From Swiss-Prot, chain A:
Role: Part of the ACTR1A/ACTB filament around which the dynactin complex is built. The dynactin multiprotein complex activates the molecular motor dynein for ultra-processive transport along microtubules.
Annotated compartments: Cytoplasm, Cytoskeleton; Cytoplasm, Cytoskeleton, Microtubule organizing center, Centrosome; Cytoplasm, Cell cortex
The protein, known as: Alpha-centractin
Source organism per UniProt: Sus scrofa (Pig)
Gene field: ACTR1A
Keywords: Acetylation, ATP-binding, Cytoplasm, Cytoskeleton, Nucleotide-binding
Tree of life domain: Eukaryota
Gene Ontology molecular function terms on file: ATP binding
One GO term describing the cellular component: cell cortex
Assembly and oligomerization: Part of the ACTR1A/ACTB filament around which the dynactin complex is built. The filament contains 8 copies of ACTR1A and 1 ACTB. Interacts with dynein and adapters such as BICD2. Interacts with BCCIP (isoform 2/alpha).
Keyword ATP-binding attached: yes
Family: Belongs to the actin family. ARP1 subfamily.
Swiss-Prot record, chain B:
Quaternary organization: Subunit of dynactin, a multiprotein complex part of a tripartite complex with dynein and a adapter, such as BICDL1, BICD2 or HOOK3. The dynactin complex is built around ACTR1A/ACTB filament and consists of an actin-related filament composed of a shoulder domain, a pointed end and a barbed end. Its length is defined by its flexible shoulder domain. The soulder is composed of 2 DCTN1 subunits, 4 DCTN2 and 2 DCTN3. The 4 DCNT2 (via N-terminus) bind the ACTR1A filament and act as molecular rulers to determine the length.
Top-rank lineage group of the source organism: Eukaryota
Organism expressing this protein natively: Sus scrofa
Name recorded for this polypeptide: Dynactin subunit 2
Residue numbers carrying Phosphotyrosine: Y4
Gene (UniProt): DCTN2
Subcellular locations according to the entry: Cytoplasm, Cytoskeleton; Cytoplasm, Cytoskeleton, Microtubule organizing center, Centrosome; Membrane
Parent-record interval covered: 3 to 87 of 405
Function noted in UniProt: Part of the dynactin complex that activates the molecular motor dynein for ultra-processive transport along microtubules. In the dynactin soulder domain, binds the ACTR1A filament and acts as a molecular ruler to determine the length. Modulates cytoplasmic dynein binding to an organelle, and plays a role in prometaphase chromosome alignment and spindle organization during mitosis. Involved in anchoring microtubules to centrosomes. May play a role in synapse formation during brain development.
PTM-bearing positions, type Phosphoserine: S73
Length: 188, 75
C-alpha cells in the first residue's frame, strides 16, 4: 500500500498508473528508490534533489518528498486513515507484555528481521526512536543482515536436517486418521 | 433603365433565394437519486451565520504533528 501510496503521489503530481504490471514497476521503483530522512520537519524545510530515474522508455522519475515521506507512514499510520501504533510502540507494548525480571535481557534481545525493512535511514533512526521510548541503560543488539529472509529458509533447512525432526513433523497416516486437531496439537 | 440599352449583361428576374414550403428526460419511475427544489434564500438561511474560524488553516502534506483540520473556530 506504500507503493500504491507512492502511485497516489504520482497522480498527485500527474502520473496515473493502474495495471498490475504497471504496479509492479512501481514496486521496483519503490524498493529501488526509498530511504528515511531522520528529521521529518527539518528536512522538509530544506530543499530536495528530485533526481530522475528513467522508465523503460526513459521518462521522469523524480525523488520528490515521496521516497522518504511515504515510508514514514509506517510509523505514523494514522495518515493512511487508520488508528494503529507503529513498530516502535508495538515492540514497546511487547516489552510491557514481558516480565520485569527479564526485560533487561529483552533490551539486549533485539532480533530484527523483515525484508521490506532494508532501506536507508531505517535502523539507526529507529534506534533514536527507541531512545525516545526506552528508558536509560538499553543495549542495542540488532540482528540485521539483509539475508534475514533467506535466513528463515536456512534455519528451516538446518531444522529439517535434524534427529528429533521426525517426531516434530506430522505423519501422513495421522492425516489419514484425523489430521486437523492433531495438526494443531503438533504445531503447539 | 439604369443600364438596359447601356449594358445588356447584368442579372435580373432571378429568384436566387432557394425556397421551400411551410411544412413543419424525466424518467422518475426509478428510485435512483433525489434532487432538491432550489431556493437560494432558503439554503442561505440554512447556512446563515456559521461563524467558521480558520485558525491555522493548514492542509499541507506536512509531517510534524498529529492531524490538521482547519475551519474550526465558531461563535
Amino acid at each position: 500500500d506504500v507503493s500504491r501510496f507512492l502511485r497516489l503521489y504520482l497522480r498527485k503530481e500527474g502520473y496515473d498508473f493502474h495495471s498490475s504490471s504497471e504496479f509492479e514497476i512501481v514496486k521496483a521503483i519503490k524498493e529501488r528508490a526509498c530511504y528515511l530522512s531522520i528529521n521529518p520537519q527539518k528536512d522538509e524545510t530544506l530543499e530536495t534533489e528530485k533526481a530522475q530515474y528513467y522508465l523503460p522508455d526513459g521518462s521522469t522519475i523524480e525523488i520528490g518528498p515521496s521516497r522518504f515521506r511515504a515510508p514514514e507512514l509506517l510509523f505514523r499510520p494514522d495518515l493512511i486513515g487508520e488508528e494503529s501504533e507503529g513498530i516502535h510502540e508495538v515492540l514497546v507494548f511487547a516489552i510491557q507484555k514481558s516480565d520485569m525480571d527479564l526485560r533487561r535481557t529483552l533490551f539486549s534481545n533485539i532480533v530484527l528481521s523483515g525484508g521490506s525493512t532494508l532501506f536507508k535511514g531505517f535502523g539507526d533512526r529507529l534506534l533514536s526512536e527507541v531512545k525516545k521510548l526506552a528508558p536509560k541503560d538499553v543495549k542495542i543488539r540488532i540482528s540485521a543482515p539483509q539475508e534475514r529472509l533467506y535466513s528463515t529458509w536456512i534455519g528451516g533447512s538446518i531444522l529439517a536436517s535434524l534427529d528429533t525432526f521426525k517426531k516434530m513433523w506430522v505423519s501422513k497416516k495421522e492425516y489419514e486418521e484425523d489430521g486437523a486437531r492433531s495438526i494443531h496439537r503438533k504445531t503447539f | 433603365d439604369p443600364k438596359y440599352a447601356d449594358l445588356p449583361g447584368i442579372a435580373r428576374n432571378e429568384p436566387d433565394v432557394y425556397e421551400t414550403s411551410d411544412l413543419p428526460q424525466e424518467e422518475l419511475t426509478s428510485t435512483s437519486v433525489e434532487h432538491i427544489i432550489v431556493n437560494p434564500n432558503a439554503a442561505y438561511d440554512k447556512f446563515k451565520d456559521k461563524r467558521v474560524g480558520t485558525k491555522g488553516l493548514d492542509f499541507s502534506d506536512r509531517i510534524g504533528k498529529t492531524k490538521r483540520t482547519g475551519y474550526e473556530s465558531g461563535e
